Design a protein around this motif. Structure first.
Motif, PDB file in Angstrom:
ATOM      1  N   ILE A  60      11.753  11.687   0.928  1.00  0.00           N
ATOM      2  CA  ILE A  60      11.992  11.207  -0.428  1.00  0.00           C
ATOM      3  C   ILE A  60      11.491  12.215  -1.452  1.00  0.00           C
ATOM      4  O   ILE A  60      10.360  12.694  -1.361  1.00  0.00           O
ATOM      5  CB  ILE A  60      11.306   9.852  -0.679  1.00  0.00           C
ATOM      6  N   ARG A  61      12.338  12.537  -2.425  1.00  0.00           N
ATOM      7  CA  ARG A  61      11.976  13.487  -3.467  1.00  0.00           C
ATOM      8  C   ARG A  61      11.116  12.851  -4.552  1.00  0.00           C
ATOM      9  O   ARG A  61      11.543  12.727  -5.700  1.00  0.00           O
ATOM     10  CB  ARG A  61      13.229  14.092  -4.094  1.00  0.00           C
ATOM     11  N   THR A  62       9.907  12.443  -4.182  1.00  0.00           N
ATOM     12  CA  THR A  62       8.915  12.044  -5.168  1.00  0.00           C
ATOM     13  C   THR A  62       8.482  13.297  -5.913  1.00  0.00           C
ATOM     14  O   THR A  62       8.752  14.410  -5.460  1.00  0.00           O
ATOM     15  CB  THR A  62       7.691  11.368  -4.521  1.00  0.00           C
ATOM     16  N   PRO A 101       7.141  21.177  10.337  1.00  0.00           N
ATOM     17  CA  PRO A 101       6.653  22.147   9.349  1.00  0.00           C
ATOM     18  C   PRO A 101       6.201  21.510   8.034  1.00  0.00           C
ATOM     19  O   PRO A 101       6.564  20.368   7.746  1.00  0.00           O
ATOM     20  CB  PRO A 101       7.871  23.045   9.115  1.00  0.00           C
ATOM     21  N   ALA A 102       5.403  22.253   7.267  1.00  0.00           N
ATOM     22  CA  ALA A 102       4.985  21.887   5.907  1.00  0.00           C
ATOM     23  C   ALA A 102       4.121  20.622   5.798  1.00  0.00           C
ATOM     24  O   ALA A 102       3.106  20.631   5.100  1.00  0.00           O
ATOM     25  CB  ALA A 102       6.212  21.752   5.008  1.00  0.00           C
ATOM     26  N   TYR A 103       4.512  19.540   6.468  1.00  0.00           N
ATOM     27  CA  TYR A 103       3.793  18.270   6.338  1.00  0.00           C
ATOM     28  C   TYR A 103       2.381  18.368   6.922  1.00  0.00           C
ATOM     29  O   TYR A 103       1.457  17.701   6.450  1.00  0.00           O
ATOM     30  CB  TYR A 103       4.581  17.137   7.007  1.00  0.00           C
ATOM     31  N   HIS A 128       0.831  -1.197   0.000  1.00  0.00           N
ATOM     32  CA  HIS A 128       0.000   0.000   0.000  1.00  0.00           C
ATOM     33  C   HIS A 128       0.870   1.253   0.000  1.00  0.00           C
ATOM     34  O   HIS A 128       1.435   1.631   1.025  1.00  0.00           O
ATOM     35  CB  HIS A 128      -0.936  -0.006   1.212  1.00  0.00           C
ATOM     36  N   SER A 129       0.982   1.886  -1.160  1.00  0.00           N
ATOM     37  CA  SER A 129       1.778   3.098  -1.298  1.00  0.00           C
ATOM     38  C   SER A 129       0.912   4.243  -1.804  1.00  0.00           C
ATOM     39  O   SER A 129       1.224   4.874  -2.814  1.00  0.00           O
ATOM     40  CB  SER A 129       2.959   2.863  -2.244  1.00  0.00           C
ATOM     41  N   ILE A 130      -0.180   4.503  -1.096  1.00  0.00           N
ATOM     42  CA  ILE A 130      -1.133   5.519  -1.513  1.00  0.00           C
ATOM     43  C   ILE A 130      -1.356   6.558  -0.419  1.00  0.00           C
ATOM     44  O   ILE A 130      -1.694   6.219   0.716  1.00  0.00           O
ATOM     45  CB  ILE A 130      -2.482   4.886  -1.901  1.00  0.00           C
ATOM     46  N   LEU A 153      14.847  20.494   6.832  1.00  0.00           N
ATOM     47  CA  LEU A 153      14.527  19.162   7.326  1.00  0.00           C
ATOM     48  C   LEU A 153      15.376  18.120   6.611  1.00  0.00           C
ATOM     49  O   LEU A 153      15.858  17.168   7.224  1.00  0.00           O
ATOM     50  CB  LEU A 153      13.037  18.857   7.143  1.00  0.00           C
ATOM     51  N   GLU A 154      15.553  18.308   5.308  1.00  0.00           N
ATOM     52  CA  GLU A 154      16.341  17.392   4.496  1.00  0.00           C
ATOM     53  C   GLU A 154      17.803  17.393   4.927  1.00  0.00           C
ATOM     54  O   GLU A 154      18.405  16.335   5.116  1.00  0.00           O
ATOM     55  CB  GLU A 154      16.226  17.756   3.015  1.00  0.00           C
ATOM     56  N   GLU A 155      18.365  18.588   5.082  1.00  0.00           N
ATOM     57  CA  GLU A 155      19.758  18.740   5.491  1.00  0.00           C
ATOM     58  C   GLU A 155      20.002  18.131   6.867  1.00  0.00           C
ATOM     59  O   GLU A 155      20.958  17.379   7.061  1.00  0.00           O
ATOM     60  CB  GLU A 155      20.161  20.219   5.491  1.00  0.00           C
ATOM     61  N   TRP A 174      -1.177  18.513   7.976  1.00  0.00           N
ATOM     62  CA  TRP A 174      -2.270  17.565   8.165  1.00  0.00           C
ATOM     63  C   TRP A 174      -1.952  16.181   7.607  1.00  0.00           C
ATOM     64  O   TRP A 174      -2.624  15.205   7.939  1.00  0.00           O
ATOM     65  CB  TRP A 174      -3.559  18.100   7.533  1.00  0.00           C
ATOM     66  N   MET A 175      -0.932  16.089   6.761  1.00  0.00           N
ATOM     67  CA  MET A 175      -0.506  14.788   6.263  1.00  0.00           C
ATOM     68  C   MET A 175       0.110  13.992   7.409  1.00  0.00           C
ATOM     69  O   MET A 175       0.028  12.763   7.444  1.00  0.00           O
ATOM     70  CB  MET A 175       0.486  14.933   5.108  1.00  0.00           C
ATOM     71  N   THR A 176       0.721  14.713   8.346  1.00  0.00           N
ATOM     72  CA  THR A 176       1.268  14.120   9.559  1.00  0.00           C
ATOM     73  C   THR A 176       0.158  13.445  10.356  1.00  0.00           C
ATOM     74  O   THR A 176       0.329  12.338  10.869  1.00  0.00           O
ATOM     75  CB  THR A 176       1.956  15.181  10.440  1.00  0.00           C
ATOM     76  N   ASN A 215      20.196   9.734   1.631  1.00  0.00           N
ATOM     77  CA  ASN A 215      20.054  10.325   0.308  1.00  0.00           C
ATOM     78  C   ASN A 215      18.589  10.373  -0.104  1.00  0.00           C
ATOM     79  O   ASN A 215      17.980   9.348  -0.409  1.00  0.00           O
ATOM     80  CB  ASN A 215      20.875   9.542  -0.719  1.00  0.00           C
ATOM     81  N   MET A 216      18.029  11.579  -0.108  1.00  0.00           N
ATOM     82  CA  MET A 216      16.618  11.782  -0.420  1.00  0.00           C
ATOM     83  C   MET A 216      16.304  11.511  -1.892  1.00  0.00           C
ATOM     84  O   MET A 216      15.141  11.416  -2.278  1.00  0.00           O
ATOM     85  CB  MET A 216      16.208  13.212  -0.059  1.00  0.00           C
ATOM     86  N   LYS A 217      17.348  11.397  -2.708  1.00  0.00           N
ATOM     87  CA  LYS A 217      17.183  11.159  -4.136  1.00  0.00           C
ATOM     88  C   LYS A 217      17.210   9.668  -4.475  1.00  0.00           C
ATOM     89  O   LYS A 217      17.009   9.278  -5.627  1.00  0.00           O
ATOM     90  CB  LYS A 217      18.274  11.894  -4.924  1.00  0.00           C
TER      91      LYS A 217
HETATM   92  C1  LIG Z   1       4.046   6.982  -0.622  1.00  0.00           C
HETATM   93  C2  LIG Z   1       3.128   8.099  -1.058  1.00  0.00           C
HETATM   94  S1  LIG Z   1       2.461   8.904   0.380  1.00  0.00           S
HETATM   95  O1  LIG Z   1       1.708  10.077   0.042  1.00  0.00           O
HETATM   96  O2  LIG Z   1       1.491   8.081   1.061  1.00  0.00           O
HETATM   97  N1  LIG Z   1       3.685   9.292   1.411  1.00  0.00           N
HETATM   98  N2  LIG Z   1       4.018   8.391   2.419  1.00  0.00           N
HETATM   99  C3  LIG Z   1       5.376   8.303   2.888  1.00  0.00           C
HETATM  100  C4  LIG Z   1       6.335   9.472   2.612  1.00  0.00           C
HETATM  101  C5  LIG Z   1       7.648   9.408   3.168  1.00  0.00           C
HETATM  102  C6  LIG Z   1       8.539  10.455   2.936  1.00  0.00           C
HETATM  103  C7  LIG Z   1       8.151  11.562   2.179  1.00  0.00           C
HETATM  104  O3  LIG Z   1       9.098  12.604   1.953  1.00  0.00           O
HETATM  105  C8  LIG Z   1       8.874  13.759   2.750  1.00  0.00           C
HETATM  106  C9  LIG Z   1       9.601  14.902   2.427  1.00  0.00           C
HETATM  107  C10 LIG Z   1      10.575  14.845   1.265  1.00  0.00           C
HETATM  108  N3  LIG Z   1      11.478  15.796   1.125  1.00  0.00           N
HETATM  109  O4  LIG Z   1      12.363  15.742   0.073  1.00  0.00           O
HETATM  110  C11 LIG Z   1       9.436  16.070   3.158  1.00  0.00           C
HETATM  111  C12 LIG Z   1       8.532  16.087   4.217  1.00  0.00           C
HETATM  112  C13 LIG Z   1       8.326  17.358   5.044  1.00  0.00           C
HETATM  113  F1  LIG Z   1       7.943  17.012   6.281  1.00  0.00           F
HETATM  114  F2  LIG Z   1       9.478  18.050   5.105  1.00  0.00           F
HETATM  115  F3  LIG Z   1       7.374  18.104   4.466  1.00  0.00           F
HETATM  116  C14 LIG Z   1       7.807  14.945   4.540  1.00  0.00           C
HETATM  117  C15 LIG Z   1       7.975  13.772   3.810  1.00  0.00           C
HETATM  118  C16 LIG Z   1       6.864  11.623   1.631  1.00  0.00           C
HETATM  119  C17 LIG Z   1       5.944  10.548   1.870  1.00  0.00           C
HETATM  120  B1  LIG Z   1       4.422  10.609   1.233  1.00  0.00           B
HETATM  121  O5  LIG Z   1       3.539  11.834   1.939  1.00  0.00           O
HETATM  122  O6  LIG Z   1       4.527  10.960  -0.395  1.00  0.00           O
END
Ligand SMILES: [C][C]S(=O)(=O)N1[N][C]C2=[C][C]=C(OC3=C(/[C]=N/[O])[C]=C(C(F)(F)F)[C]=[C]3)[C]=C2[B]1([O])[O]
Length: 264
Positions: free
Chosen positions: A193-195, A155-157, A92-94, A213-215, A159-161, A226-228
């Motif tokens: 991760i830099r998606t 920061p930034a994340y 599950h990667s959604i 946060l990345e640094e 409500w996804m948090t 490595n975020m890449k």
């Molecule tokens: C898999 C898809 S997902 O939607 O469900 N998902 N889950 C895991 C997940 C793990 C790490 C992620 O990378 C970040 C970054 C990246 N910076 O380069 C910055 C911040 C922040 F906090 F700085 F904003 C948070 C997560 C993203 C995702 B996620 O939200 O894409």
């Protein structure tokens, strides 16, 4: 001989070739897994992304908000995997969250309609998918979801948090249900991760704070981060899909370079 030799695994969440799910799928196929891939709303364009994978794989339509899609998923997977055959793994990667609930947008200014949609997709769907697929899973199977450590605010994340916090709680309950089938349920908490999804947020004050946060993450990580490079995360997911963590369920595996164990 590969880690997932002769295993049938469903992988969802492949949007682009930079999606975490794509690398999970890539590594899985490299290790001998036979895959079933799902997508939505751009199946012509998605199939062409899928075609770059090492091996061919069937592509099924799944909108995790559509109850009809979920009610027929199990059967549609069987018609592809073959009768008498069951799934050994589900990935599950959604995840999703409207702009109003992320980035520079004030945390209080996100209307619940947007937050509810994000939580439906990011958290509730994990149970919806487990409900639909567990009946056609073999004992010893493995359900794996994706996570970003929400135990502390950031920061930034935004409500996804919160949606990730709910997901962690949902996972623990999915594990209770999955145990009856002999199936494990776990999340992989990855480092940043830099998606293409996150890459957009960085560009689209908040973007600078993401860099911070990345640094800080790479410095903190004893072995670096490595975020890449999504490969270390994908291998972690495949580890959970194998038979080498057979006593682990309802749990979280941290593939973050060890950052969450370090303060500074
Ligand atoms: C898999 C898809 S997902 O939607 O469900 N998902 N889950 C895991 C997940 C793990 C790490 C992620 O990378 C970040 C970054 C990246 N910076 O380069 C910055 C911040 C922040 F906090 F700085 F904003 C948070 C997560 C993203 C995702 B996620 O939200 O894409």
């Amino acid at each position: 001989t590969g880690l997932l030799d002769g295993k049938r695994i469903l992988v969802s969440g492949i949007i682009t070739d930079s999606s975490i799910a794509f690398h999970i799928a890539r590594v899985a196929q490299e290790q001998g897994a036979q895959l079933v891939l799902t997508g939505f709303d751009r199946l012509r364009l998605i199939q062409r992304i899928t075609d770059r994978l090492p091996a061919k794989a069937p592509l099924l339509e799944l909108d995790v908000q559509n109850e009809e899609h979920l009610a027929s998923l199990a059967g549609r997977v069987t018609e592809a995997i073959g009768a008498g055959n069951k799934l050994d793994g589900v990935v599950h990667s959604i995840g999703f969250m409207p702009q109003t609930g992320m980035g520079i947008n004030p945390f209080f200014d996100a209307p619940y309609a947007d937050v509810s949609k994000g939580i439906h997709i990011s958290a509730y769907s994990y149970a919806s998918m487990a409900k639909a697929l567990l009946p056609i899973m073999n004992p010893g199977g493995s359900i794996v979801g994706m996570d970003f450590d929400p135990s502390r605010a950031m920061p930034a994340y935004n409500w996804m948090t919160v949606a990730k916090s709910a997901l962690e709680s949902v996972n623990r309950f999915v594990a209770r249900e999955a145990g009856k089938y002999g199936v494990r349920s776990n999340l992989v908490a990855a480092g940043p991760i830099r998606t293409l999804a996150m890459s957009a947020i960085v560009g689209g004050e908040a973007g600078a704070q993401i860099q911070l946060l990345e640094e800080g993450w790479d410095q903190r990580a004893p072995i670096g981060w490595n975020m890449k490079d999504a490969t270390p995360v994908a291998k972690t997911v495949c580890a959970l899909l194998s038979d080498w963590l057979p006593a682990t369920t309802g749990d979280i595996i941290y593939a973050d370079g060890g950052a969450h164990t370090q303060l500074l």
